[PDB]
Design a binder for these strands. Structure first.
Length: 1108
RNA sequence: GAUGAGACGCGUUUUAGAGCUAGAAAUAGCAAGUUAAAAUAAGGCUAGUCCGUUAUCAACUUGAAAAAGUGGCACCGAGUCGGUGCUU
DNA sequence: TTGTACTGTAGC
DNA sequence: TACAGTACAA
């Protein structure tokens, strides 16, 4: 009657088992539908559900964000063309059309093949006069004569399309662009972060060293030689190496137990820093971001090398000089190679495949690969000294479009565009009428707090309009309601407190959150108040020596004090307090308790917004308290991220008996100390009661709102479905208790507790019909290790179901609390039939791989556009199949035409999924199938199970790919032998337990020679990999004499042959066995298709040999 | 630890940037190369400077969908479950 | 002309 | 890890 269900949730597996009060798994004759001969199969109430991991939305957001950027960039180009078209029509009728159809082959091109002028003579004249776009840009800046309108459009479109970054706010000035200024800023925060043993850099010249044209290591060494107190391996040298773009090791300087490294690579814009500051703390992030902006200063000064003259547009002239040096150095390299090393001349300049100059230009070889290829060549070749330093300084034969251009601010392109429009203002009146329009097209950026400019049809937009019309950059300021949109951004961006999920979290930099983390570290209150007022409110970093010298000896008059709470220095700090004291300089204003809301609203404003306008509006309310220079400075300050506690928790809720908040208890608790975890946990405090009341609020309400990765949510939803089907199996009877694995544990317990215990009374608040019991994995693992019921991951996926049954057994034994019970548990662990089910899931994602392949005559290339034939324009490859579809039809075959019936699978890809589901019959008719029988169309997702002769099971991975779907049910004594054979000298138990394991593995060593026969039999029956079987048998026979460790580890990798899933390449001692791929789905046309439920206890078997 | 907004720079793809000479040639020698346009998931309609890779998904019967419903028990054994006995 | 075998490919 | 490209058996 009464029964228990034990569960085991993982990221990719949910194992389940049903036990009785005698710790036995029941077995029932489950009915099976379908046209097969079998009507009922005996199945056991134990199994596991296997599924592909749940994915974070992050990659989908990266794609979504880029998808908007390309759209808005095309819209910018369209705005510029909209401005230009009316005047351009009387100059060239089909210029924009030619620029649109420039991608097309000449046969598909309606107009002339030359995009700019449409005549070959003028195009050749253009390319001779301006070999790059920057020559045209520099001329248009530096010429007063009337220029052609189309070249002006080309220059402005090149600057509007590729407009550079917005990281620097305001106009360009040396205070944030000249390398010396931000170098002094870097050493300023370097001194502020420690203030013990600082570095002082006053007489040094940064622009002489960092902007010098020299190799990077030599520049670093010279800068280190300018500072005798620091070295290259020092933390300052580490920071300067980051500024130079090297790969320094911060873990060495901060004594981390694991390697931590950073570099500002071409598409990792300091985002790797999370793994470092998760360990070393967030105090150093201001050091690293200043290093990043100093790096941007160094690159900007490097590529603006012509800024030594004010005579022209700096970036265009600098690219011109780079082109000139590239040409003059290239002809020298060609002569130097041809004169003295005629061999490999063709390899460098003609081959275009071996990373030469031809591979640098016409091939996919980067700058550093090209340098690495030719560096041995230049070491061998003579006369290369003046040219090799260009490799050592990364200046040799550089292109104009490179990864370093990400450091270019938008102000440079803005200045060049302004210079062009001011130079051509009188010649074209519509430039005078639309100078501000084009400058606004270049300089407009959608704010943080606005989001997508939608009209209700977006999941993501909170943007609120004040009018119903099209939004352009010119009329943006009078259409969006900024107050409503910014307010709506706050309502979304506030996180909620994990203790009280109704309540808004504080800013991380919030002053009360600083006081919290300080006082929580000291309690691990007159003395507390004196220490905080004397040191913490005076200095950023306080050590134990400062406490014993400046407080205990000075105030308490204690000569010798021993402190054990804190080792060296306090991790917490009042940094926001000292920051405010630096900016406002009216210290007593923060002493007034009334102003706390004003201060925390200010730091809330800076933690919300990044743009100047809304920040200016929100703090402008406080202008009657203070004014002028303090706003003028604090408008540049910003903060990032959020605390754990709500403002509603920390000082908001008051204990119902003591009349004190959490921070009130932290400040004073009488003659003894108490910490935050205890303040929540102590039953003497009503915080325990109030949190356990207020923490609780459909299944999706709990799953969507709770904190966790989509990977662990998937196991929770599947574990609820498994519970529902197991209740359905047992006559709708509920379990006596449900056992769960292991802070997510209390949310999983709430979901199952609330789905089972739906009844309540007037006096009983909750009737515990079912007791959801939570256990820790340490207990089950210790039970497994102590009593010889060992497990491995490599033999089979039966360990999930065995883990679930052990969870059930230990949980029931614990709530109720060595003979027949041990025999029962050993019989169940050696019990062969376990309902392993791989979840059949329609594949979703990108419908193909992202790499665009060149043109070819194959029909397998996917068209990148509707009118772009992939035989001519290239296209994508490797499409992803959402699901396969079993079709029977007639196919037109042969020159002498007849209609032959065929049955075959066809893969419906993701892009053809919707077109298939609108009309399957016409979609199949378009593929050549005619007389298609509609009712026999069977949808076959990924992991569809088929059964063939001798119990051979195959899982469908695609339309033309199968997978191994059988489990090797090796007996429990052999898995015990295998586990004890491995880990031979690392049990870390008693020596006697060690030796009773060793004689067990030794004197049954013929078990190994029997398990290899087990592998051979199982593989010959269901795997059909005979060549690999002979290979592994020969390798096992000729490595028989190698001892227990290596042999019984390589035989653990040997089960990769018999493991269900894709065939993977395992390895023996030395030999590596290539996988045997099942690239033929012809055999499952006459197999038995298996429709397994979530538990797999209910099946619907269709015999496909009776169809067609 | 979840989620979201705004931006940059590469990369790839086709085309434009007239290749020259010896050549019956399959080709050989030389010259040249750095840039730009267009696309960046096919596309969708409420046509927005929006949306399109996350989450959900065994089979059957109802239901536009949502959603609901659909499958006997005990014992003896074990090569992916078998056999025996009651029951409608 | 249709199936198999082996090796290579895949955005940041 | 499923698909692509080249290379053979009929």
């Amino acid at each position: 009657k009464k029964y228990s269900i034990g569960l085991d949730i993982g990221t990719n597996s949910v194992g389940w088992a049903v036990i009785t009060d005698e710790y036995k798994v029941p077995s029932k004759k489950f009915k099976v539908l379908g046209n097969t001969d079998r009507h009922s199969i005996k199945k056991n109430l134990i199994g596991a559900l296997l599924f592909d991991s749940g994915e974070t939305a992050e990659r989908t957001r990266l794609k979504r964000t880029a998808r908007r950027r390309y759209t808005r960039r095309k819209n910018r180009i369209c705005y510029l063309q909209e401005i230009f078209s009316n005047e351009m029509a009387k100059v060239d009728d089909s210029f924009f059309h030619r620029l649109e159809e420039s991608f097309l082959v000449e046969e598909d091109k309606k107009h002339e093949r030359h995009p700019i002028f449409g005549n070959i003579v003028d195009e050749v004249a253009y390319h001779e006069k301006y070999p790059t776009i920057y020559h045209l840009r520099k001329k248009l800046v530096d010429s007063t004569d009337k220029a052609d309108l189309r070249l002006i459009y080309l220059a402005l479109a090149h600057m509007i399309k590729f407009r550079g970054h917005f990281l620097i706010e305001g106009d360009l000035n040396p205070d944030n662009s000249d390398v010396d200024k931000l170098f002094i800023q870097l050493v300023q925060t370097y001194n502020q972060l420690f203030e013990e043993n600082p570095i002082n850099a006053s007489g040094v010249d940064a622009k002489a060293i960092l902007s010098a044209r020299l190799s990077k290591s030599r520049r670093l060494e010279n800068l280190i030689a300018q500072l005798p107190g620091e070295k290259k391996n020092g933390l300052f040298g580490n920071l300067i190496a980051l500024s130079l773009g090297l790969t320094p090791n911060f873990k060495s300087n901060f004594d981390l137990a694991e390697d931590a490294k950073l570099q500002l690579s071409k598409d990792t814009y300091d985002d790797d820093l999370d793994n470092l500051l998760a360990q070393i703390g967030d105090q150093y992030a201001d050091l690293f971001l200043a290093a990043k902006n100093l790096s941007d200063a160094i690159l900007l000064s490097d590529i603006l090398r012509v800024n030594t003259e004010i005579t022209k547009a700096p970036l265009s002239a600098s690219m011109i000089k780079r082109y000139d040096e590239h040409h003059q150095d290239l002809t020298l390299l060609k002569a130097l190679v041809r004169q003295q090393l005629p061999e490999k001349y063709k390899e460098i300049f003609f081959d275009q495949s071996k990373n030469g100059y031809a591979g640098y230009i016409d091939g996919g070889a980067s700058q550093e690969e090209f340098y690495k290829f030719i560096k041995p060549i230049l070491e061998k070749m003579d006369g290369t000294e003046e040219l090799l330093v260009k490799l050592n300084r990364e200046d040799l034969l550089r292109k104009q479009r490179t990864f370093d251009n990400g450091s270019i601010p938008h102000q440079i392109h803005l200045g060049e565009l302004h210079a062009i429009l001011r130079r051509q203002e009188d010649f074209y009146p519509f430039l005078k009428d639309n100078r501000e329009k084009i400058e606004k097209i270049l300089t407009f950026r959608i704010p943080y707090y606005v989001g997508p400019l939608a009209r209700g049809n977006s999941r993501f937009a909170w943007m609120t309009r004040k009018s119903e019309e099209t939004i352009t950059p010119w009329n943006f300021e009078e259409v969006v309601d900024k107050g409503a949109s910014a307010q709506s951004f706050i309502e979304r961006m506030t996180n909620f407190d994990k203790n009280l999920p109704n309540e808004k979290v504080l800013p991380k930099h919030s002053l009360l959150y600083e006081y919290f983390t300080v006082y929580n570290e000291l309690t691990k209150g007159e003395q507390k108040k004196a220490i905080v007022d004397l040191l913490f409110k005076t200095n950023r970093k306080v050590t134990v020596k400062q406490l014993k010298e400046d407080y205990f000896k000075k105030i308490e008059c204690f000569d010798s004090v021993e402190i054990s709470g804190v080792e060296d220095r306090f991790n917490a700090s009042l940094g926001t307090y000292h920051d405010l004291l630096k900016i406002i300089k009216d210290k007593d204003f923060l002493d007034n308790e009334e102003n706390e809301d004003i201060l925390e609203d200010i730091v809330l404003t800076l933690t919300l917004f990044e743009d100047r306008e809304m920040i200016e509006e929100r703090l402008k309310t406080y202008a009657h308290l203070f004014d002028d220079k303090v706003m003028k400075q604090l408008k540049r300050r910003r903060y990032t991220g959020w605390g754990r506690l709500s403002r509603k928790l920390i000082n908001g809720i008051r204990d119902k008996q003591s009349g004190k908040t959490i921070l009130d208890f932290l400040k004073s608790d009488g003659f003894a100390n108490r910490n935050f975890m205890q303040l929540i946990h102590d039953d003497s405090l009503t915080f325990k009661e109030d949190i356990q009341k207020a923490q609780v609020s459909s299944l999706h309400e709990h799953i969507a709102n709770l904190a966790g990765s989509p990977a662990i949510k998937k196991g929770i939803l599947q574990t609820v479905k498994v519970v529902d089907e197991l209740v359905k199996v047992m006559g709708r009877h509920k379990p006596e208790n449900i056992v769960i694995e292991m802070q997510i544990t209390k949310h999983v317990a709430q979901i199952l507790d609330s789905r089972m215990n739906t009844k309540y009374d007037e006096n009983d608040k909750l009737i515990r019909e079912v007791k959801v019991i939570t256990l820790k994995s340490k207990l089950v693992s210790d039970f497994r290790k102590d009593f010889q019921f060992y497990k491995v991951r490599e033999i089979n996926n039966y360990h999930h179901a065995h883990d679930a049954y052990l969870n059930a057994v230990v949980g029931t034994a614990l709530i109720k609390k060595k003979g027949r019970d041990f025999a029962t548990v050993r019989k169940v662990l050696s019990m062969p039939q376990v309902n392993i089910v791989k979840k059949t899931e329609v594949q979703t994602g990108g419908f193909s791989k992202e790499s665009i392949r060149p043109k070819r005559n194959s029909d397998k290339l996917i068209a990148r556009k509707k009118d772009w034939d992939p035989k001519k324009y290239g296209g994508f490859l490797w499409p992803t199949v959402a699901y396969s579809v079993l079709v029977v039809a007639k196919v037109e075959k042969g020159k002498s035409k007849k209609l032959k019936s065929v049955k075959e699978l066809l893969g419906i890809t993701i892009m053809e999924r919707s077109s298939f589901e609108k009309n399957p019959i016409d979609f199949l008719e378009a593929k050549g199938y005619k007389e298609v029988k509609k009712d026999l169309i069977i949808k076959l997702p990924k992991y569809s199970l088929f059964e063939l002769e001798n119990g051979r099971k195959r899982m469908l991975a695609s339309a033309k790919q199968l997978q191994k779907g059988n489990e090797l049910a090796l007996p429990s004594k052999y898995v015990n032998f295998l586990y004890l054979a491995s880990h031979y000298e690392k049990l870390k138990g008693s020596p006697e337990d060690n030796e009773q394991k060793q004689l067990f593995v030794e004197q049954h060593k013929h078990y190994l020679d029997e398990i290899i026969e087990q592998i051979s039999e199982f593989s010959k029956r269901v795997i059909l990999a005979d060549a690999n079987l002979d290979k592994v048998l020969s390798a096992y026979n000729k490595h028989r004499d190698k001892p227990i460790r290596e042999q019984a580890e390589n035989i653990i990798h040997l089960f990769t042959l018999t493991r269900l899933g894709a065939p993977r390449a395992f390895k023996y001692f030395d030999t590596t066995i290539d996988p045997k791929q099942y690239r033929s789905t012809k055999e499952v046309l006459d197999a038995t298709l298996i429709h397994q439920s979530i538990t797999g206890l209910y099946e619907t078997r269709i015999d496909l040999s009776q169809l067609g």
